[PDB]
Amino acid sequence: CGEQNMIGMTPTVIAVHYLDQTEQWEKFGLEKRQEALELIKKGYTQQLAFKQPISAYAAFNNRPPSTWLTAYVSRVFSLAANLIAIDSQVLCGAVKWLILEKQKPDGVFQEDGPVIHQEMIGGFRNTKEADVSLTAFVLIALQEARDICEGQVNSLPGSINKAGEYLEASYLNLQRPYTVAIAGYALALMNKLEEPYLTKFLNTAKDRNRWEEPGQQLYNVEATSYALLALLLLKDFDSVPPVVRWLNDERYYGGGYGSTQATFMVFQALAQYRADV
Amino acid sequence: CGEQNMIGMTPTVIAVHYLDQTEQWEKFGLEKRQEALELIKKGYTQQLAFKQPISAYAAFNNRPPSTWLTAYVSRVFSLAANLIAIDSQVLCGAVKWLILEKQKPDGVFQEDGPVIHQEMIGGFRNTKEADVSLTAFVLIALQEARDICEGQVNSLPGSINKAGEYLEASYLNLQRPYTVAIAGYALALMNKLEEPYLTKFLNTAKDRNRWEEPGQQLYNVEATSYALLALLLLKDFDSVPPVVRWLNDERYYGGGYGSTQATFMVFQALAQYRADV
C-alpha cells in the first residue's frame, strides 16, 4: 500500500544519502551502493502505482488523498532525485496539488485524509499545535522541491512565503519543543530565524543539546534533528557539538514501528553537519 | 514475499524485545507497545502464507526451500513467542525439517536453495568459511528453539551436539573474525568455549572491542554482537565494557538495505548485557 511503501523505502534512501555526503563508503563497502540504489528504484516505481490522477497520494488508489503523505512523497522524491532518475512531472504535480488544493489563505496546510499509519508521521501525531506541525512539514518539503519544481510551479515561492509568515505569526506562542524545532528550521530556511524568534528557539532546548518532550524518544530525535539543521543554517557552529553528540547517543530504532521521521531526519541532519563542518 | 516479510518484521520484533528487557518504555512511550505488537502479529501471520507443506520456507511457495531462511524464521519466531502467540507446531515443524533434511553426518548444515535477498544474511554472504557460518547460525537458531521445541523434536539435542562438535573441529583453523565470533557464541552456548578455543576467540578481536573484517561495517556489528553474547555467557564482565561501548558508537542502518542481521543481533546482545549486568 502507498503508505507502507514509503515506510519501507525511507531508511535506504537516507542511508545512501548519508554515506554519500560523509564519504563513508570505504568502511561500509562501496560495492554495496548499487544494490541499495536498485532497492530505491523499486520503491519509486512501486510508489507511482499509488499516484492518483490528481498527482496526490493515499494508501490505496480508492482512498481520498493525504496532504501529509503527498508532502512526504515530495520530501523523499526531492532528495532521491539526486540518487535515482525521478520524473519531475510526477514530483511537481504533487507540489502543484498541495498548493492549489490544500493551502488556506492564511498559509496553513490542511489534512483532509489522515494517514492510516499514524506512526510514520513523527511528532505530528501529537495533534497539539498541529496546524504548525503540518504547515512547517509541508513548507520544508516544498522548499526541498524548489530545485526541481520552482520553474514548473510558479505558485511555489508565494506559497512558501505565506506558510512562512503563518509560522512567524504563530512562533512566539508555541508551547511544544517539537513545533519550535520544526518551525524553527522552516523559518531558518527562509532566513526568518532571527530575534525575537531565535531566543524562543534556543531557550526551548534542554542542556543545549536537545528539544525534548516527555515520553517521546523518537519525536525528540526528529525534533532535535530539525533543530540541528537550523543551527547549521544559522552558521552557529558553537551550538552544534552538544546537539551532534546527543543525537549520536540516541537509539532511533530504524526500520522499527514509528521510526520513519526519526530515521529520515537524523541522517539528513548528521550528513549536513559533516558537509558544513 | 517470504524473505522480504522477515526483513520487514525484524526491527520491530527486536526493538520490543530490547525495550522490554532493559525496561526502557518510560522514555520511549509505554503507550506505543501494543501497536508494535500488532505489527509483529501481522508479520507472523503473513509469514505463515509462505510455509510449505514440509514446514520450511522460501520467498515464494513455488521456490525450493532455503535452509538459511527456515532457520532465520526459527530464530525470529523463537524470540517472538515471548511477545505474541506462536503455534509451536509451525515453529517445531521447521526445526524438524532442518535436522532431518539439511544436516549432514559430520554435523554441517547445507543450503540447497539460497535466498534471493542475499543482503539479509549478514556475514554469511561472504562465502569464505560458509559451512561454519551456516552451521553456527543454524545451531544458534536451534538452541533458541529448545525452550519450545526440545520436547516436540527429540532429535534436537543430538543435532545440536553434532553441529557443535563440527564447530569445535573447525575452530582453531578459522581465518575470519566473523566466523570466530558466530562460532564462538555457538560454542559458548554449549559450554565449549574453553581453551584452546578461548584464546583463539579473544586473540581475533581488535582493540579488545570488536571482531572486524575490512570494508564490512554491518558484518562487523553483527559479529561483534555475537562476540558480546559469548563474553556474557563466559561471565567475563571485565572484557565487556569496551565491546558495549564500540557497539553503541556504530551506525547499523536499521531498516536499511543489508541491515537485517546487524539489527537483530545488536539489540539481542545489548539487551542481554543489561539483563546480565
UniProtKB/Swiss-Prot annotation, chains A, B:
There is a cross-link at residues 1-4 (Isoglutamyl cysteine thioester (Cys-Gln)). Disulfide bonds join 92-149. It comes from the Eukaryota. Interacts with CFH. Interacts with CR2. This is Complement C3d fragment. It comes from Rattus norvegicus (Rat). The chain holds residues 1010 to 1286 of 1663 of the full protein.
